[PDB]
């Protein structure tokens, strides 16, 4: 695309500058350019890709929720015309476009080249996340298939992570956290969400003794998110 003429290393360097400048749309465009060079991503590069798109889609999701709430209030009320629905639809279409972009990068060809557990689980978790973001706005005949696509990606990531990673590994923990959110918020399965969060927390607790001080801090930060959700849910 528009980044085709820029060196891979320059795209990565500029993605890091864009992060420091809080220019997340630029960061995402730079990281998409880097992915499209066709080489596998290092751990740091995968995390830059994730940070960029998480911030872009996060702003869209927050906006969509504001607009959807106004739209639902409008239907409880004075008729204000088509504008709320139109603008919610525009934000929704842009959100779906970003999710499709991320899913396209994963399918062409990040996942198929990812052989190590750390990279494969990272990408499958991302696939689950972006289908989950599509599911948050889905209302039509494909909602069930979108939900199943998220579930399937998360499940494959879970299966690999349980075989290949220790229970404190931050990728494994973040995957379990997000899959538990999927169960609670998308799949109407709060008991599954609670069970997954509890088991994940307890198995990580039992493995903390193996960790360095720095790894301990990384793992316990995510465990606290699991605990925070459990406190909300129970």
């Amino acid at each position: 695309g528009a980044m085709g003429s820029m060196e891979r290393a320059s795209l990565i360097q500029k993605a890091k500058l864009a992060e420091q400048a809080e220019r997340y749309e630029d960061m995402a465009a730079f990281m998409k350019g880097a992915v499209e060079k066709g080489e596998e991503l290092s751990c740091e590069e995968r995390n830059l890709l994730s940070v960029a798109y998480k911030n872009v889609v996060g702003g869209q999701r927050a906006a969509w929720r504001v607009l959807s709430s106004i739209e639902q209030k409008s239907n409880e009320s004075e008729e204000k015309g088509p504008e709320v629905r139109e603008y919610r639809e525009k934000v929704e279409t842009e959100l779906q476009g970003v999710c499709d972009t991320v899913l396209g990068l994963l399918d062409s060809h990040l996942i198929k080249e990812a052989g190590d557990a750390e990279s494969r689980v990272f990408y499958l978790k991302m696939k689950g996340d972006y289908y989950r973001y599509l599911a948050e706005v889905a209302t039509g005949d494909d909602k069930k298939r979108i939900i199943d696509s998220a579930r399937s990606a998360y499940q494959e990531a879970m299966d690999i992570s349980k075989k290949e990673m220790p229970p404190t590994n931050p990728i494994r923990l973040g995957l379990a956290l997000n899959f538990s959110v999927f169960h609670y918020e998308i799949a109407n399965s709060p008991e599954e969400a609670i069970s997954l969060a509890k088991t994940t927390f307890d198995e990580a607790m039992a493995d903390l003794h193996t960790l360095s001080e720095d790894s301990y801090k990384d793992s316990t930060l995510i465990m606290q998110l699991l605990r925070d959700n459990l406190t909300l849910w129970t």
Binding site: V181, Y184, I222, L225
Partner: peptide, 7 residues
């Protein structure tokens, strides 16, 4: 409030 996914 609302539950949180990975930061």
């Amino acid at each position: 409030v609302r539950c949180s996914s990975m930061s």
